[PDB]
Amino acid sequence: MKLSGVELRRVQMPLVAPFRTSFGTQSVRELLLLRAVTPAGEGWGECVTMAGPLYSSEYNDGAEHVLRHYLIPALLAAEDITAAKVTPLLAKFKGHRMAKGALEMAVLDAELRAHERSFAAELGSVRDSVPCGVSVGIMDTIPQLLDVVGGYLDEGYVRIKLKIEPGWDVEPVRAVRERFGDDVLLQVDANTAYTLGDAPQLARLDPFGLLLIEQPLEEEDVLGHAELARRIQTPICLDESIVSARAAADAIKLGAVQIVNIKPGRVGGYLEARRVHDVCAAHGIPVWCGDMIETGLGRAANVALASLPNFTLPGDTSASDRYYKTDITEPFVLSGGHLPVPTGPGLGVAPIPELLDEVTTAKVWIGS
Amino acid sequence: MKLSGVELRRVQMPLVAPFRTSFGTQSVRELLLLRAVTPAGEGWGECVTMAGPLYSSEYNDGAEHVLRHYLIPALLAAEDITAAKVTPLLAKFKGHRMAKGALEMAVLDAELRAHERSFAAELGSVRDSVPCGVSVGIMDTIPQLLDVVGGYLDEGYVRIKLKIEPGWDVEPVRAVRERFGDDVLLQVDANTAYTLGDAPQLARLDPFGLLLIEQPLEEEDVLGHAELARRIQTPICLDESIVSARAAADAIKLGAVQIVNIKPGRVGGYLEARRVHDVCAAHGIPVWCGDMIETGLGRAANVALASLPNFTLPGDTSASDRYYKTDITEPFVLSGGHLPVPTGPGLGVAPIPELLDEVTTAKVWIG
Amino acid sequence: MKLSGVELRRVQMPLVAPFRTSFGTQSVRELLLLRAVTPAGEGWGECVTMAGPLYSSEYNDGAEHVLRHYLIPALLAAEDITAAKVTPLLAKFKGHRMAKGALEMAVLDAELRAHERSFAAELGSVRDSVPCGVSVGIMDTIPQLLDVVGGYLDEGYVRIKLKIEPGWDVEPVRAVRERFGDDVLLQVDANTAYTLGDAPQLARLDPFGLLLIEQPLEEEDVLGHAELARRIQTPICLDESIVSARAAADAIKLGAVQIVNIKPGRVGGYLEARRVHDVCAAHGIPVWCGDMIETGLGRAANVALASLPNFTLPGDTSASDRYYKTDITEPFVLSGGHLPVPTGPGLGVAPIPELLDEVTTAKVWIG
Amino acid sequence: MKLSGVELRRVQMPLVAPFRTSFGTQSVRELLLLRAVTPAGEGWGECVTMAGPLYSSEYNDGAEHVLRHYLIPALLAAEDITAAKVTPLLAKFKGHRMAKGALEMAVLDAELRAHERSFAAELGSVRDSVPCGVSVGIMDTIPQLLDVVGGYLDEGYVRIKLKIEPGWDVEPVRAVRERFGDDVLLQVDANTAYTLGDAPQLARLDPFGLLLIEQPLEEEDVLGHAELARRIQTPICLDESIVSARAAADAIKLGAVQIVNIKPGRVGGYLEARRVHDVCAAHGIPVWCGDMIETGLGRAANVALASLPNFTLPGDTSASDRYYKTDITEPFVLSGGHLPVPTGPGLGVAPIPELLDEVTTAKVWIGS
Ligand SMILES: CC(=O)N[C@@H](Cc1ccc2ccccc2c1)C(=O)O
Ligand SMILES: CC(=O)N[C@@H](Cc1ccc2ccccc2c1)C(=O)O
Ligand SMILES: CC(=O)N[C@@H](Cc1ccc2ccccc2c1)C(=O)O
Ligand SMILES: CC(=O)N[C@@H](Cc1ccc2ccccc2c1)C(=O)O
Ligand SMILES: [Mg+2]
Ligand SMILES: [Mg+2]
Ligand SMILES: [Mg+2]
Ligand SMILES: [Mg+2]
């Protein structure tokens, strides 16, 4: 398989309601999509960067620059490629994992389509649907939060995740537990907003039976997470820190993590995400599938990946309409709290050309 | 894919020379092969059990019994199957890893043939040929050993592995190093023949620069290997102990192993073998591909597996004629110390019917 | 101090000889310079990124983009600024340390110029000159290497650092020691080129008495470095892994590092570099000053930083003419193996406008 | 800069109310001040020793003797000096940290004044005011204590620290919590008055939610503090034991301390105090600013130092009138629970000559 070129698109999609995390509020999702072109067929990739470097150091214009000037040219110059060979072909470039993972995703989709093989089959799926949670942002008031949570519960979502930050942690958790009870699956996510000095405040979450607290400290503070685990009862989950399978093995050995959130872009693609799942399984560490507000393309791949055997807690892969009035693929629709795993070749979905054109703000071709 | 049935064949293949390990001498290889039949087509699996339970608890008649009475009927009762689903469909049956791995291998070959996809592509190959070592048995005398070793080096094998046991360790090593020099890649394999009380004898291997000593102690003695590693300079490699990816992670965490031999049948199949490779890579532990004297069917799958990126030491996947005058597939032929990775769909090879019929001693259809 | 604006300039400076590391060969240095303008006066900053992301994830076009669209506008929106406040004003932007450090450097130079205070005084200098080593690249042949090394020793450099990679480690070291003897201060730098599986090869460096081996493994592999240190005799030094004072403390606690290379841009600026120095001193870990082939602006700041008390091994801050026929400031000239610490306000040097204009390929004003 | 001489003064300042710790009651503060004289200008330093060696081995007459006969002469003999060079110039003399820190403070103030640079700027301030607690002594009765605490709370102090000792620990803490509630920030300080054998008594503080227990055991017993931490719930803070940045790193590695009190004189001066702050920050250990009942000179420097970023708990730098009816500088006045960081050159304050003369009991010049 030779890669002939890539068409890179910038896409903008308004959210049905603004989404607030500890790093800010977003009301529109801006993203990059990649259409890889080979003599045997096309494939689609999606990048999970945001507009600015608020979640990690990567962001849309940076990922676009590196794809255009380093990563795509390296794959174009290669005589033969496969998705597994993308990693060594790009190894000389440091970091840029989300960008590399998007490009890998496109290459894999093209390769798999040519063999009439689904992402699910390639990744090792063992079931045909997955249970889905939802991630709920920070609100201006507690009554708004309780209405939003009760709405999701009425749609049949099986687990609630709350964004937290200093000033919005113990009270929202208490209120949710009072309104909805002790049997709801509940967890929280700080997106790096605390320090080890906040351990007393985080220990105040102890009586609420949370499944986990996701990424309370900064990305690089692995040892600090292991020290926090010794002071709080809520199990520690890591997101931003888990940049690779080796990083997962490290964090596990250090006592820094009991449960791991797997996001394929964050680790440099779907193939490394599978290795993360396998390393965690081999150490008895449960995983769940993370979500970066992807279009149906990324959502489809994520639903496939979430059907592997060590994904034993509900993921953040919500239905398309949690975020988007109109998706660019056929939409993912919740059914009895589950999403169905896609079945055709590759991702199992592709953009509806008319809907994609409507949300495309620019595109560029990168050829030889 | 619905599994229609499986044919189980018993095959006997004489070796070009008898092969002696610490558990005995074998002059013929007796093995079981599986042909899985689906409405798409067929796939071939090979079991790595021997005649008796001398290497591990599994052996040919046992594997055949469990396949016929438990494992194959479980897959036949399933609505849909895929190679990845073989593991949960069989998880209620404890152990029997070599038997399960053979069945998974047949399923995976059928599945991959239907998608026109090679084992190499499915497993994540990054290169199109692999460097091959050879495993040399215990001999009656040191001069014989030196003739056999020189012969393999003249064929271009890139590394020499010597089988060892009490009474045949330090002297054969010393002689090989004196004859052939310090630059030859050299390692030893005890197949569980020592105890922790033999540590002083194994420490006598220290001045010879061996790459590793493979499985000096028994399969279950993971802690003992970690204590041995504190007393000897030669790095520890595990084979028999590594029964799964979890067992690899455990052994690594305990300090019991620095290098891991991966045998797909021993771990329950090619899919778990990949997971073993990935768990070792994540901990910085090099792997290399083991060999159970397979026909070209298993050899083909193994060459594919050995082309993954963390396989950074030469494997035991020798050319077909190290073992067999006539293989049942197109033979693997060493070239510049390497074997080429197969390219067609599935395994990339299949039995030549006339040659297979010639070495087949029994067969049965399980539908 | 209110920041009025920043000029960003792109500069290209040919090297007097090509410089080869494990990540490739560079014959020209392309860099970004910043001129921060305040109502008091001006200050100069220099970014240590290269053209592409081969040493770390940051590179010139990337750093320029993030400075223009995020970092400089954040400082322009602030009411009052000081160099110490640059860090919290930019903390919401993840990573981008070399870019932030360049901007901090310009701010700090403007601020210190206004108080008539040198970098050396602000950072806590305890001496007025520093002993300098040199970093020597990989060569095509061993005789070339020996000519280049003898040349630097004849200039009076007090220590030799060799770039190494697989295929160029033990032999060049052995040759340097044979030619120049056991009393020369000698160390090696892999720039991440090895894995833990190469430990036996790196252990072959043991008999040569190296001061250290710098960053043998990848940037994120802190645990792997601690495991390597248990297998080899040469002390481990980290460069790429040391991205902050916290990262230094972590690496030290884990047993991953015995000696630390401090590069101000790599850690996010001169103020964090001081904190790295102080954290290492509190744990008994020696530091030395790294070099990114800076112009006289960065070289000046680095010589100042290298005069702090825990810098007890010779740095890589070579004289200007190790790299450049004509520097853009008054050049640094070795004297008795030392460079003098600058004495005026700020950096103590500034660009000679004619020489700067000559190597400037682009510039833009961000107001 | 050459140091030409130092004028050393003994000063006596009556306290507005006697102050009782585990080592005794003091009703007057006796202290040493230093006026360093250089051709470019003067600088002020203040020593934190007391009259007798009850808090540490250093005391006023001893610090005066060592300054006059060893430390000042060593700096006078030096060709050129800077505050950073004070440490190596004095390294040959063992110990005497408070004395050395006073001399360093004067030299630094003189150097910074000459560059028109504040202590805040030199030390790395990131904010222009700091939240202040108060330290409250041992009283003869519980009702007196409760009146004193309620008075400070009415002045707007943000945190209460109680001196404790055998016979005055659990009861005063219980009474404070009963009167003032669970939300007041509360901590205790033993000044070395307990042994490891008192662990059961100290564990009886567990239900009161104290932020910390400061220096329960003797200065040299670092390992003992780590063992006590395994038996009590109240986090351990160290004061007397933290004599340097290396001592802080040691105590942290041994598990002996979760929170560190920084006193610049105790560690040998403001420059080492900054290194203490940075070492603790790098290990995720919060710090707060200690107080030795300084005049406005030491108070000004301490308020500057307390504005650095890892000072995340309220310090003991109370307003001047917590101790003194009339300070020797313009006084520090609490405003909304905070003190403002000084802004001019050096310390930002200097003695009012008339007020200083009134409280000066003796002075001596040490010249070449
Ligand atoms: C479902 C969830 O909480 N996702 C991310 C955060 C995230 C949040 C908001 C975003 C807005 C625009 C673009 C990317 C975003 C990523 C997380 O787990 O941390
Ligand atoms: C190449 C190598 O040394 N193989 C195995 C052992 C092995 C040895 C001999 C056998 C003889 C007949 C059947 C199966 C056998 C398996 C090992 O690595 O331990
Ligand atoms: C003096 C030394 O070895 N420097 C760096 C690497 C480095 C090397 C080469 C470069 C070439 C062009 C631009 C930046 C460069 C940075 C190091 O210590 O790892
Ligand atoms: C505010 C506080 O509690 N300070 C010191 C103790 C202290 C107490 C009383 C003193 C009386 C005269 C001179 C020096 C003194 C120092 C401490 O933290 O341990
Ligand atoms: Mg998250
Ligand atoms: Mg073996
Ligand atoms: Mg380096
Ligand atoms: Mg105290």
Tab-separated table of C-alpha atoms in Angstrom, chain C residues 31-257:
chain	number	residue	atom	x	y	z
C	31	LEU	CA	16.915	30.126	15.728
C	32	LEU	CA	14.362	32.619	17.036
C	33	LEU	CA	15.221	35.727	18.992
C	34	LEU	CA	12.930	37.969	20.897
C	35	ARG	CA	13.232	41.629	21.690
C	36	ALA	CA	10.885	42.679	24.418
C	37	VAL	CA	10.126	46.420	24.527
C	38	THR	CA	8.977	48.222	27.709
C	39	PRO	CA	8.724	51.966	28.447
C	40	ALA	CA	12.046	51.597	30.403
C	41	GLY	CA	13.965	49.938	27.527
C	42	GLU	CA	14.497	46.632	25.834
C	43	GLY	CA	15.563	43.036	26.633
C	44	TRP	CA	16.674	40.120	24.526
C	45	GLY	CA	15.574	36.484	24.679
C	46	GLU	CA	16.742	33.495	22.690
C	47	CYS	CA	14.778	30.271	21.994
C	48	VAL	CA	16.674	26.948	21.963
C	49	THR	CA	14.351	25.126	19.580
C	50	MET	CA	15.753	23.658	16.347
C	51	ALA	CA	14.167	23.568	12.932
C	52	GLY	CA	12.352	20.217	13.458
C	53	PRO	CA	11.142	18.196	16.475
C	54	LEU	CA	14.156	15.840	16.596
C	55	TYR	CA	15.527	16.664	20.117
C	56	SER	CA	12.162	17.373	21.741
C	57	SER	CA	8.593	18.083	20.530
C	58	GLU	CA	9.211	21.844	20.203
C	59	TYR	CA	10.601	23.368	17.014
C	60	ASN	CA	11.075	26.865	15.535
C	61	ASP	CA	7.842	27.310	13.583
C	62	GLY	CA	5.914	25.834	16.494
C	63	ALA	CA	7.473	28.051	19.087
C	64	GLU	CA	6.925	31.111	16.904
C	65	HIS	CA	3.211	30.199	16.496
C	66	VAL	CA	2.562	29.643	20.177
C	67	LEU	CA	4.486	32.860	21.147
C	68	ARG	CA	2.529	34.918	18.652
C	69	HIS	CA	-0.928	33.516	19.288
C	70	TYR	CA	-0.914	32.671	22.973
C	71	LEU	CA	2.075	33.591	25.065
C	72	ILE	CA	2.905	37.161	23.983
C	73	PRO	CA	-0.813	38.192	23.957
C	74	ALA	CA	-1.177	36.854	27.498
C	75	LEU	CA	1.688	39.041	28.709
C	76	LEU	CA	0.389	42.089	26.733
C	77	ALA	CA	-3.004	41.763	28.423
C	78	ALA	CA	-1.491	41.892	31.905
C	79	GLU	CA	-1.494	45.098	33.937
C	80	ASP	CA	1.863	44.737	35.503
C	81	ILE	CA	4.519	42.142	34.817
C	82	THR	CA	7.774	40.906	36.291
C	83	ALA	CA	9.864	37.968	35.207
C	84	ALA	CA	8.643	35.966	38.211
C	85	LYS	CA	5.048	36.563	37.189
C	86	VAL	CA	5.561	35.301	33.675
C	87	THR	CA	5.112	31.694	34.924
C	88	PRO	CA	1.641	32.082	36.484
C	89	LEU	CA	0.526	34.355	33.646
C	90	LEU	CA	1.329	31.535	31.217
C	91	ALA	CA	0.501	28.480	33.390
C	92	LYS	CA	-2.835	27.801	31.631
C	93	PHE	CA	-0.892	26.903	28.402
C	94	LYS	CA	0.441	23.369	28.751
C	95	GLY	CA	4.042	22.559	27.789
C	96	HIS	CA	5.851	24.825	25.334
C	97	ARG	CA	8.727	25.269	27.806
C	98	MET	CA	11.458	26.445	25.385
C	99	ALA	CA	9.096	29.130	24.029
C	100	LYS	CA	8.071	30.260	27.503
C	101	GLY	CA	11.735	30.297	28.631
C	102	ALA	CA	12.753	32.518	25.689
C	103	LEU	CA	10.013	34.992	26.549
C	104	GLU	CA	10.918	34.937	30.248
C	105	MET	CA	14.549	35.536	29.304
C	106	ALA	CA	13.621	38.762	27.369
C	107	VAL	CA	11.470	40.004	30.173
C	108	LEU	CA	14.172	39.273	32.742
C	109	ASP	CA	16.848	41.033	30.647
C	110	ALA	CA	14.651	44.158	30.326
C	111	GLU	CA	13.886	44.127	34.054
C	112	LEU	CA	17.464	43.603	35.154
C	113	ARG	CA	18.807	46.327	32.721
C	114	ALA	CA	16.387	48.773	34.379
C	115	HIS	CA	17.899	47.977	37.807
C	116	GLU	CA	21.482	47.922	36.493
C	117	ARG	CA	21.862	44.353	37.695
C	118	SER	CA	23.547	41.484	35.879
C	119	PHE	CA	22.079	37.962	35.293
C	120	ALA	CA	24.976	36.676	37.387
C	121	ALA	CA	23.964	38.805	40.377
C	122	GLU	CA	20.318	37.976	40.111
C	123	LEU	CA	20.966	34.226	39.799
C	124	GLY	CA	23.535	34.102	42.732
C	125	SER	CA	26.982	33.829	41.099
C	126	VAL	CA	29.838	32.972	43.363
C	127	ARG	CA	32.724	33.205	40.888
C	128	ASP	CA	33.816	35.292	37.957
C	129	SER	CA	34.785	32.695	35.384
C	130	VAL	CA	33.822	29.066	34.671
C	131	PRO	CA	35.737	26.015	33.281
C	132	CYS	CA	34.441	24.920	29.882
C	133	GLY	CA	34.250	21.594	28.108
C	134	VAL	CA	33.345	20.858	24.525
C	135	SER	CA	30.804	18.498	22.858
C	136	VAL	CA	32.140	16.586	19.865
C	137	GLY	CA	29.916	14.954	17.265
C	138	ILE	CA	29.856	11.580	15.665
C	139	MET	CA	32.420	11.367	12.782
C	140	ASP	CA	32.750	9.097	9.726
C	141	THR	CA	36.007	7.673	10.959
C	142	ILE	CA	38.005	7.234	14.129
C	143	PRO	CA	41.077	9.112	12.831
C	144	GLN	CA	38.889	12.165	12.186
C	145	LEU	CA	37.537	11.987	15.684
C	146	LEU	CA	41.020	11.828	17.142
C	147	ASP	CA	42.118	14.915	15.140
C	148	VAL	CA	39.084	16.905	16.268
C	149	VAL	CA	39.537	15.872	19.954
C	150	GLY	CA	43.284	16.726	19.897
C	151	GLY	CA	42.482	20.124	18.427
C	152	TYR	CA	40.081	21.004	21.260
C	153	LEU	CA	42.488	19.785	23.890
C	154	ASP	CA	45.169	22.019	22.301
C	155	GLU	CA	42.792	24.984	22.675
C	156	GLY	CA	42.598	24.290	26.407
C	157	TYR	CA	39.061	22.825	26.803
C	158	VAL	CA	39.058	21.069	30.173
C	159	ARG	CA	36.758	18.122	29.286
C	160	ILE	CA	35.667	16.121	26.275
C	161	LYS	CA	32.064	14.974	25.604
C	162	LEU	CA	31.486	12.497	22.755
C	163	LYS	CA	28.148	12.040	21.020
C	164	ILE	CA	27.379	8.323	20.738
C	165	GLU	CA	24.826	5.979	19.098
C	166	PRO	CA	24.498	2.308	18.278
C	167	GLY	CA	27.547	1.482	16.096
C	168	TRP	CA	29.612	4.368	17.625
C	169	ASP	CA	30.194	3.993	21.329
C	170	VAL	CA	32.801	1.564	22.642
C	171	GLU	CA	35.244	2.019	19.731
C	172	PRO	CA	35.431	5.766	19.713
C	173	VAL	CA	35.760	5.781	23.507
C	174	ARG	CA	38.461	3.123	23.456
C	175	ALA	CA	40.397	5.091	20.785
C	176	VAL	CA	40.195	8.373	22.645
C	177	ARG	CA	41.441	6.781	25.835
C	178	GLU	CA	44.316	5.015	23.982
C	179	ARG	CA	45.383	8.215	22.218
C	180	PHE	CA	44.914	10.749	24.964
C	181	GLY	CA	45.195	8.816	28.203
C	182	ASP	CA	43.243	8.173	31.418
C	183	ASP	CA	43.566	11.604	32.915
C	184	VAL	CA	41.445	13.437	30.305
C	185	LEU	CA	37.907	14.175	31.661
C	186	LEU	CA	35.704	12.174	29.301
C	187	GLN	CA	31.935	11.524	29.087
C	188	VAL	CA	29.430	10.394	26.421
C	189	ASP	CA	25.913	11.556	25.295
C	190	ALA	CA	23.425	9.315	23.472
C	191	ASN	CA	20.538	11.803	23.033
C	192	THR	CA	18.007	8.931	23.771
C	193	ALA	CA	19.424	6.499	21.262
C	194	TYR	CA	19.470	3.279	23.353
C	195	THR	CA	16.918	0.996	25.079
C	196	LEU	CA	17.214	-1.049	28.291
C	197	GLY	CA	17.957	-4.072	26.080
C	198	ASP	CA	21.247	-2.377	25.063
C	199	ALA	CA	22.469	-2.521	28.686
C	200	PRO	CA	25.147	-5.164	27.835
C	201	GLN	CA	26.641	-2.932	25.148
C	202	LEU	CA	26.642	0.128	27.482
C	203	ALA	CA	28.256	-2.008	30.241
C	204	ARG	CA	31.219	-2.387	27.844
C	205	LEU	CA	31.974	1.280	28.599
C	206	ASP	CA	32.685	0.324	32.232
C	207	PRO	CA	36.551	0.030	31.989
C	208	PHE	CA	37.000	3.498	30.483
C	209	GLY	CA	36.367	5.660	33.538
C	210	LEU	CA	33.788	7.933	32.000
C	211	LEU	CA	32.397	10.718	34.205
C	212	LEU	CA	28.902	9.932	33.024
C	213	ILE	CA	26.661	8.773	30.245
C	214	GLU	CA	24.087	11.355	29.315
C	215	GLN	CA	20.537	10.422	28.463
C	216	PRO	CA	21.044	6.907	27.164
C	217	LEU	CA	17.229	6.205	27.035
C	218	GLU	CA	14.122	8.060	25.992
C	219	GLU	CA	12.886	11.280	27.701
C	220	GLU	CA	9.873	9.616	29.426
C	221	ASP	CA	11.723	6.490	30.621
C	222	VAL	CA	12.786	7.545	34.117
C	223	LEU	CA	12.260	4.090	35.661
C	224	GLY	CA	14.224	2.486	32.845
C	225	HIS	CA	17.213	4.782	33.636
C	226	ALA	CA	17.112	3.655	37.283
C	227	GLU	CA	17.140	0.018	36.133
C	228	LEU	CA	20.052	0.752	33.754
C	229	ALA	CA	22.050	2.327	36.601
C	230	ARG	CA	21.882	-0.994	38.428
C	231	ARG	CA	23.519	-2.703	35.461
C	232	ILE	CA	26.300	-0.394	34.397
C	233	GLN	CA	29.150	1.302	36.152
C	234	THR	CA	29.167	4.607	34.286
C	235	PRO	CA	27.053	7.190	36.279
C	236	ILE	CA	23.755	8.222	34.671
C	237	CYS	CA	23.188	11.873	33.705
C	238	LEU	CA	19.873	13.177	32.462
C	239	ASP	CA	19.241	16.011	29.973
C	240	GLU	CA	15.957	15.556	27.977
C	241	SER	CA	14.127	13.976	30.991
C	242	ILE	CA	14.809	16.994	33.258
C	243	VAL	CA	11.942	19.261	32.243
C	244	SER	CA	11.453	20.991	35.627
C	245	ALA	CA	12.645	21.058	39.245
C	246	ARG	CA	9.911	18.649	40.126
C	247	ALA	CA	11.078	16.255	37.390
C	248	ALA	CA	14.609	16.494	38.833
C	249	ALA	CA	13.311	15.664	42.353
C	250	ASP	CA	11.325	12.710	41.005
C	251	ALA	CA	14.245	11.304	39.003
C	252	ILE	CA	16.570	11.661	42.025
C	253	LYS	CA	14.103	9.912	44.407
C	254	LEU	CA	13.737	7.046	41.963
C	255	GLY	CA	17.481	6.417	41.629
C	256	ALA	CA	17.381	7.379	37.998
C	257	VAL	CA	20.119	10.045	37.957
